[PDB]
Write a protein that binds this DNA or RNA. Structure first.
Lengths: 32, 65, 155, 115
RNA sequence: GGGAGACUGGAAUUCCUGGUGUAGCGGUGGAAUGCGCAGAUAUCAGGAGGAACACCGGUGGCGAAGGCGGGUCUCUGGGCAGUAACUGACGCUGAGGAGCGAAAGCGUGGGGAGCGAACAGGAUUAGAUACCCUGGUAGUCCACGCCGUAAACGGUGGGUACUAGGUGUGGGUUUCCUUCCUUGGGAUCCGUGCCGUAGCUAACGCAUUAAGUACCCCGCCUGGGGAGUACGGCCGCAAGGCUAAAACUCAAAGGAAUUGACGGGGGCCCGCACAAGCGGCGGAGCAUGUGGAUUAAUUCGAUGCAACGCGAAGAACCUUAC
């Protein structure tokens, strides 16, 4: 296939992972 | 393509003590020479390599003169 | 010169002396497009050599040529950003051309004020090895056996 | 001192070239390097600088009374043969030439590859 | 080189100690930080320590996959071939479930030569939180446990039977030449590559190791984003992993091949392109043209090669448009 599709998937995953790292302490406070 | 001298009925058995046979299959720098040059089969080339290493450890052959 | 070797021009024989050397010399010394001056200059130099050395001009000219004819030359070839001065043997034609070129080139740096005795004097010196072009000839030989370090490329 | 037979160690790298004249027992009596003869930067990686360094080392060892030399040459060749010829030209004698380049048996980890 | 344990060998890098020995070494497209002159680099001799095992060594062997080569010993798993003595359908697949599972990462305790995220300088640049250079912590290594993911790929689930061949190679049995050595050749079983029919495919291509012809069982798919995300739940020390939507939004997103164009992609062939030679320009004075600056205007156009003795083959008034 092409690598455009993998590129879209990796861009979305990278943004989500960065967001998940940015709010670690707030999530830890809320969940527990 | 040559024949394996050990596969013939008159091929000597391979031992790490008998260092002349091993000197036959090592180059002037002490390295083991490729199986294409010697022409011997897979099993006997493996035997020769193991014997050369064993003789090298007991200091009967040099470690790459 | 990309397709193949170029044709070689014929050389007209001299009517006065009968050797191609003098006509080659007058061609080499020719300047600005005046033949007549050129052969009169070279003939005056020949006659002054005649009256000075006491021997024939042809034999002393050939002896001077042999004393100036080189056998090896230097060619510059670049690779990987480094230029190497490979020594190369010389075809006889290039040797003769270089000898005449060197003689005429060192004919023009003298102080003795006119061309004919300049040429005669250097002919005598090259016959005896006292010239300036000869100095460059043994210099070229000195770098020929000096720059032997770059010969395995063979270019 | 007067040692009539010594040894020459030529180490040629991609950035320099250094020649050391030693006694047959490993004591240096004269050394010269490609930047010791007046070269800087990249210019000391050239064969010409190797020639000059070899000539200078040969002369300084010669004034100590050295006649014949065994050559142990080493490193990724940049000015090896030029150094050999410069030793021969400067009035020395080269008896034997041997390449002694350190060869690992796959130990240690080389640095990452440039890009 | 299938796995686990113990002992052990040599080359090389680093550091320390001692000789000889000097003023440079290192690095790069070029340099500078950096190391030395308090004795560096280099060359000898001795010692300490850790990690990986040149040559043999390959599209070659083994393993269910991940993966496995310095030597020796100890313990142990799978495969193939021949004989066919033995049991007598005991077979295949397998929802959930369990076990193994590269690298990175986590916990406790060791170890630490080389390399090297993060971090400091130097250089490049309009700027360089990068590429290049000099240092360098976790980590890489060992013991015992967590995690459970990879472009974990043949992007090809397992079992079985049939369908032209040619030619390499690994393991084993047999017959004909028999010299009884040899890839001597043939036959047969089990692997591993290339080429090729029929057949299949949208095409590329697969082709007895099928993506062909058929039967049994499992997993999965139903336009692209939102999204493998949210809520709920389970697991984990943590990082996070597994199960898994909707509102909304677009009229497409895709796969293969074809013709051009382009490449800071290649290969051949030409040309005064280089080379081999002769004569010049850039240095001086002068004539033109242009850029720039002044004033009333210094009329307008031309502006890498392909503008600069060009429109202009003729500016005192005229020309001339200022």
């Amino acid at each position: 296939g092409s690598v455009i599709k993998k590129r879209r998937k990796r861009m979305s995953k990278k943004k989500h992972r960065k967001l998940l790292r940015r709010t670690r302490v707030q999530r830890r406070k809320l969940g527990k | 393509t040559r024949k394996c001298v050990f596969c013939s009925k008159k091929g000597q058995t391979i031992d790490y003590k008998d260092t002349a046979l091993l000197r036959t299959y090592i180059s002037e720098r002490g390295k083991i020479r490729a199986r294409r040059v010697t022409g011997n089969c897979v099993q006997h080339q493996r035997d020769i390599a193991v014997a050369v290493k064993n003789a090298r450890e007991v200091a009967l052959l040099p470690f790459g003169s | 010169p990309r397709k193949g070797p170029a044709p070689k021009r014929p050389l007209v024989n001299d009517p006065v002396y009968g050797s191609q050397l003098v006509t080659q010399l007058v061609n080499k010394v020719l300047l600005e497009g005046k033949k007549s001056l050129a052969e009169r200059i070279v003939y005056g130099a020949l006659e002054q050599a005649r009256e000075k050395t006491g021997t024939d001009p042809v034999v002393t000219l050939k002896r001077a040529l042999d004393n100036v004819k080189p056998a090896l030359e230097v060619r510059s070839r670049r690779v990987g950003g480094a230029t190497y001065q490979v020594p190369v043997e010389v075809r006889p034609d290039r040797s003769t051309t270089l000898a005449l070129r060197w003689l005429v080139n060192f004919s023009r740096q003298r102080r003795e004020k006119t061309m004919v005795e300049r040429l005669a004097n250097e002919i005598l010196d090259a016959s005896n090895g006292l010239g300036a072009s000869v100095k460059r000839r043994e210099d070229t030989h000195k770098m020929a056996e000096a720059n032997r370090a770059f010969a395995h490329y063979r270019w | 001192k007067n040692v009539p037979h010594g040894a020459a160690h030529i180490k040629s790298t991609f950035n320099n070239t250094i020649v050391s004249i030693t006694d047959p027992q490993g004591n240096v009596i004269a050394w010269a390097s490609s930047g010791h003869v007046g070269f800087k930067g990249s210019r000391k990686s050239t064969p010409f600088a190797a020639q000059l360094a070899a000539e200078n080392a040969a002369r300084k060892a010669q004034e100590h009374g050295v006649k014949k030399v065994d050559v142990f040459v080493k490193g990724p060749g940049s000015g090896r043969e030029t150094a050999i010829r410069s030793l021969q030209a400067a009035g020395l004698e080269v008896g034997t030439i041997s390449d002694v380049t350190p060869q690992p048996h796959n130990g240690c980890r080389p640095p990452k590859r440039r890009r």
